[PDB]
Write a protein that binds this ligand. Sequence first.
Ligand SMILES: CN(C(=O)Oc1c(N2CCN(CCO)C2=O)cc(C(F)(F)F)cc1C(F)(F)F)c1ccc(F)cc1
Ligand SMILES: Nc1nc2c(ncn2[C@H]2CC[C@@H](COP(=O)(O)OP(=O)(O)OP(=O)(O)O)O2)c(=O)[nH]1
Ligand SMILES: [Mg+2]
Length: 627
Amino acid sequence: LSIIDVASDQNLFQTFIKEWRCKKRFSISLACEKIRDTLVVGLAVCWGGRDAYYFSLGGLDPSLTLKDRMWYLQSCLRKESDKECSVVIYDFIQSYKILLLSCGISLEQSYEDPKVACWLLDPDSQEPTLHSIVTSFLPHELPLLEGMETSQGIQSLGLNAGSEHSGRYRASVESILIFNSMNQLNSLLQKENLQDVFRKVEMPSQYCLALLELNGIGFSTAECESQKHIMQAKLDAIETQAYQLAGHSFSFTSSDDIAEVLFLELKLPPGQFSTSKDVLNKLKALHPLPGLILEWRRITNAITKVVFPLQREKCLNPFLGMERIYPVSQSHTATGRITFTEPNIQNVPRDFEIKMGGSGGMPFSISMRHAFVPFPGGSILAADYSQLELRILAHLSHDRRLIQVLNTGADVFRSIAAEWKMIEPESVGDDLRQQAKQICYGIIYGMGAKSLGEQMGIKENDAACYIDSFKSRYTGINQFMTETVKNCKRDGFVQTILGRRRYLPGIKDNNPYRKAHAERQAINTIVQGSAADIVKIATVNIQKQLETFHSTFKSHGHREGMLCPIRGGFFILQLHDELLYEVAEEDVVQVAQIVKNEMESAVKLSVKLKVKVKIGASWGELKDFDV
DNA sequence: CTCCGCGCTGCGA
DNA sequence: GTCGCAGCGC
Ligand SMILES: CN(C(=O)Oc1c(N2CCN(CCO)C2=O)cc(C(F)(F)F)cc1C(F)(F)F)c1ccc(F)cc1
Ligand SMILES: Nc1nc2c(ncn2[C@H]2CC[C@@H](COP(=O)(O)OP(=O)(O)OP(=O)(O)O)O2)c(=O)[nH]1
Ligand SMILES: [Mg+2]
C-alpha cells in the first residue's frame, strides 16, 4: 500500500509534519522489533485512505538526526490549548506506556481506542482483535491482513515483534485499519447515543488505568515471607493433627478419602457424601476435623495462589527504592467493572486469624493486605462507597424500607445474622457478617430456596420462609425487579445509569434455567454496572482535580524519566466499590478531600452517596481519617 | 441439561 | 496444551 517513508527526504519530512499539524484526528501504530527484546523502530500515521506515513526512529536523510526527529514527534503529540486533536491507537494503555518508557513522549491529546468501542457496543462480546474489528467493521480491507496471522492475537500488530513481517509493514497496516475502523465505530456509537460515554468516562478511565499500571502497588517481600512461614507452619500442624484425629493419612484434596473419614469412619451426619464447604461448615460444629479441612483450604489458597504468585511478579523500582508489584488492567467485563491480572491483587485474602501453640494456641493475625506498602514517607489512602450497590437500588426501586435501613446506620449484614443466628447484632463477627452478606445479596438477586437452606444450614422450606419474608418486608425492591424483567423482555437489553446496554437475548428462552439466568442477570447488571460507572466517573474526576493543584508529577513512570521530591498522590488499585491511592505525607489531607468530594459529586441520586475515607501505612493497616 | 451476580487462577484430568 | 472445578476477592 501507500507507505510514505517521511524520514527519507528533508522536504518530504517537513511536508508530512506540516500536514500532521492541520489534522484534528489521526492514528498511531508503534512499531516494535527484536534486538537480534522489544525496541521501538518507528511509528505509523494515517489521516485517511490507505496512506501510511512511517516515522523511522532508527535509508534516512543524515540531516534528520534522531534528536531532531524526536522534537517534531513530540511537537505533534502534545496538546497546545484547543488543538482539537483526537488520536486513535489500538492499545491505548500499553501504547501510552511504551511511548513514555521507550521514547519519552507523554501523550496529551484526546484518545480513541477501537477495542473500548467494541465492548461499549456489546459488553458480552469477545475480546476484540484486529481481525475481529476488521471482519466486523471494515471487511472491505480484510485481504490486507492476509498472511499476517498475528492479527488473531490481542497484541497489537505493530507491537508484535514475534511476527516475521517487518515492523514497518505491521505498523503501517494497523495504522490505516484502526483509523478507518474507528470512523465506523464512531458512526455506530453516535447512533446508540453512547458516543459521549466512550469519550467522557470510559476512555478517560483507561488513561487513569494506564497511570496506575506505571505506578504499581508497593510490596514488602519481608512481610510476605514472615506471614508465609506462620501460614505454612499451621498448614504443617493441621496435617499432623488431622492425621492423628483420623488415625490414618488422607489427602485434603481427595474428596473420596475425606468423605470416608467424616461420614463413614467418624459416623458424621450427611444429596450425601459431599465434602462441600457449605456442608463442612455445618459439620464444623460436631468434630474438629470438618473445621481443620476448611482451614487447610484457606491457608493453601493463600500460600499457593496469592503468596507464591505475588513473590514472582515483584520488580525493583530503583528510583523509589522499593519492590513494587506491577499488575495489568482489564476493563473488558460485562458489568463495566475493572479487574486485574498478572497478578490479581484484587483477590488478596482478607484478614484471618490462625491459632498456633499449646493450650489455646496463640492468636496470630494474617492480613496479606499488609505487605502492600507506600513509598518512604507515604501512605495508602483508601476510600469506600459504603453500600453503593444498595443505594442505587434505592434510587431505582424506590423501596420505602431499603431507604429506611439506609438512613438508620445499622449494619444490615450484621442484622441479618442477628435474625438468622438469633444473636445480638453487635456479636456478629466478620466471618458471620461475610456469610450474611452473601445471603443478603444473593436473595436480592434471585437466590433459590435450595441454595439458601444449604448456606443457612437449615431446610429448604425453612429457608423459603426467609425469602418470603424479604418479599413481604421489602416490597419496592420486587416492584422494580418485576418491572425490570418487563423492560428487558420488551427490549432485549438492560441499561445502566450512563446508558450502557447489556444485551440479554436469553430472557425469552424456552428452558426455565435459561430465562432465569437472564432474568437474574438483568437485575444484577442494572445495579452492578451503575455502580462501576459511579466509581469510574469518580476515578477520572479525582485524577482531573489532582492534575489541577499540580506542583507534582502524574505517575511514577512519568517522573522516572524527568530524573526529586515525590509530593503528589498516586493511583494503585481500584476495588469494585473502593478506590486506593498512595498519597504523600505533605498532602495526605488535600488528596483525601479531593477523593471524597468527587466520589460524592460524581453522580446525583435520590439517596446521597456516603463515602468513608481511611488512611495508613498498609492496605491492611488502615485507620479512619476525618477529611 | 438445571436455577444470586461479576471476576481471576492453580491443579488435576 | 486446554478446560472444569473450586479456592479466594468485590
Ligand atoms: C427476611 N430477612 C431479612 O429481611 O433480611 C434482610 C434485611 N434485614 C436485616 C434485618 N432486618 C430487620 C428489619 O430491618 C431486615 O429486614 C435487610 C435487607 C436489605 F437491607 F438489604 F434490604 C435484606 C434482607 C434479606 F436478607 F432478606 F435480603 C432475612 C433473610 C435471611 C436471613 F438469614 C435473615 C433475615
Ligand atoms: N451478588 C453479589 N454481589 C457482591 C458479593 N460480594 C460483593 N458484591 C458486590 C455488591 C456490593 C459490592 C461491594 O462489595 P464489598 O465486598 O466491598 O461490600 P460492602 O457490603 O460494600 O462492604 P462493608 O459493609 O464491609 O464495608 O460488590 C456477593 O457475594 N454477591
Ligand atoms: Mg464496601
